[PDB]
């Protein structure tokens, strides 16, 4: 008997240490395997039905609907510590009236800046663009004023949603997946701000997560958009960084980032699903274990009495402010095609292959086509 876990590099060390604690207390060995975050869900979709998925996976709550309706993750039973998690975090992991994960953290992106180049937080996106241009000119191109994973809808959503875009309409009967707002007037305005930054040379079409992240660590990026998951690596790199909400899109109009919840899900096909569930509900969910996880991966705790311990940490304060005007990612099965359609639209936009209106129109048509053909149903 061996419990297997897949998780990104941010959680491997602490989960292997906790796994040794669990073995010391219950005699069940735990094997934690690094999987690059962007491969976890895709690998689980193909491996789990073959009996080759991990017993437990760690990842983001938007996966829940797709995995649940495909029979791949197990509903979490009631347990004594359930009450101790924020309802926002539990709702993110709930679908169709059932909880499908034990959450450990809540998150949203923010503006992260290097104080070697930025002395005050730009008050608006127009000010940010001007400061970034100033930096690009002042240091001769050696330092990037602003860089982020621009073609990735997760990171460009703050602009698209902030102006009034939405994924699916909220209704008293749940999300209406036939009412898609990713090509509305606000979505277009937000994507046009992105294209304006490309036009003014503040962003480039080749910018991606790795180029942004390594440049910031090297001390050669003044401003980026990233989450609290990366702050430990910037501390280790020696960057004197600051954190603030993404500057207002217009005076008095905030950016609207996605809110994500990270948590543990149980493979419904696993022969070890009973003990895996016990590991989550009776061990991972404890206050002591959740605090150990925070110290190693210091995202906002999903457990209220753990957040209370760390509420004055300046990173916690700044990322809480950034998330405060955000919106949680949808977790319905129909969220599955949204990422690729909008990512393709953003690539088209930043490469000048089509107008913003045409690219977003095509993205919405693609999403509707994927929903109508049931792209979220695998068999
Ligand atoms: O079609 C493209 C891909 O679309 C889907 O990926 C989505 C995810 O489902 C979303 O959750 C989100 O991903 C975020 C993530 O929520 C956020 O935490 C952050 O990820 C961190 C990670 O937590 C951390 O531990 C470490 O590993 O670094 C990651 C960042 O590199 O950022 C993610 C965004 O990159 O958005 C993506 C789309 O970008 C789908 O699940 C994929 O299968 C699909 O390929």
TrEMBL record:
- List, for all copies, the residue spans of the domain called Proteasome alpha-type subunits: 86-108
Could you give one GO CC term from the UniProt record?
ATP-binding cassette (ABC) transporter complex, substrate-binding subunit-containing
Does Signal count among this protein's keywords? yes
Q: Which Pfam families match?
A: SBP_bac_8
Lineage: superkingdom: Bacteria
Return the InterPro entries for the record.
Answer: Maltose/Cyclodextrin-bd, Proteasome_asu_N, SBP
One biological process GO term for this chain?
Answer: ubiquitin-dependent protein catabolic process
One MF annotation (Gene Ontology) recorded for this entry:
maltose binding
**Keyword line:** Signal, Sugar transport, Transport
Q: Which family does it belong to?
A: Belongs to the bacterial solute-binding protein 1 family.
Descriptive protein name = Maltose ABC transporter, periplasmic maltose-binding protein
Organism annotation = Thermotoga maritima (strain ATCC 43589 / DSM 3109 / JCM 10099 / NBRC 100826 / MSB8)
Taxonomy of origin reads: Bacteria, Thermotogati, Thermotogota, Thermotogae, Thermotogales
């Amino acid at each position: 008997t061996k419990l297997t876990i897949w998780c990104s590099e941010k959680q491997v060390d602490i989960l292997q240490k906790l796994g040794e604690e669990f073995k010391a207390k219950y005699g069940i060995p735990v094997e934690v395997q690094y999987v690059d975050f962007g491969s976890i869900k895709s690998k689980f979709l193909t491996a789990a039905p073959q009996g080759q998925g991990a017993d437990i996976i760690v990842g983001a709550h938007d996966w829940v609907g797709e995995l649940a309706v495909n029979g791949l993750i197990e509903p979490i039973p009631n347990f004594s510590d359930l009450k101790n998690f924020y309802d926002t975090a539990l709702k993110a992991f709930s679908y169709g009236g059932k909880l499908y994960g034990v959450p450990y953290a809540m998150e949203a992106v923010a503006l992260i800046y290097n104080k070697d180049y930025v002395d005050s937080v730009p008050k608006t996106m127009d000010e940010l663009i001007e400061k970034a241009k100033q930096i690009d000119e002042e240091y001769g191109g050696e330092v990037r004023g602003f860089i982020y994973d621009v073609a990735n809808f997760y990171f460009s959503a703050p602009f698209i949603l902030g102006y009034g875009g939405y994924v699916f309409k909220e209704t008293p009967q749940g999300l209406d997946v036939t009412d898609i707002g990713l090509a509305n007037e606000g979505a277009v305005k937000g994507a046009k701000l992105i294209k304006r930054m490309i036009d003014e040379g503040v962003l480039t079409p080749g910018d991606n997560y790795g180029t942004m992240d390594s440049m910031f660590k090297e001390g050669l990026a003044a401003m980026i958009i990233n989450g609290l998951w990366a702050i430990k690596s910037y501390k280790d790199a020696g960057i004197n960084y600051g954190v603030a909400p993404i500057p207002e899109l217009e005076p008095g109009v905030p950016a609207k980032p996605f809110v994500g919840v990270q948590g543990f899900m149980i493979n419904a096909k696993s022969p070890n699903k009973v003990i895996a569930m016990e590991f989550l509900t009776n061990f991972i969910a404890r206050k002591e274990t959740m605090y150990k996880i925070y110290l190693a991966d210091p995202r906002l705790p999903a457990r209220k009495d753990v957040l209370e311990l760390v509420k004055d940490n300046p990173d916690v304060v700044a990322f809480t402010q950034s998330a405060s005007m955000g919106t949680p990612m949808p977790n319905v099965p129909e969220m599955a095609p949204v990422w690729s359609a909008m990512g393709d639209a953003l690539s088209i936009i930043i490469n000048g292959q089509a107008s913003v209106e045409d690219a977003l129109k095509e993205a919405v048509e693609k999403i509707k086509a994927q929903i109508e053909k049931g792209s979220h149903h695998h068999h």
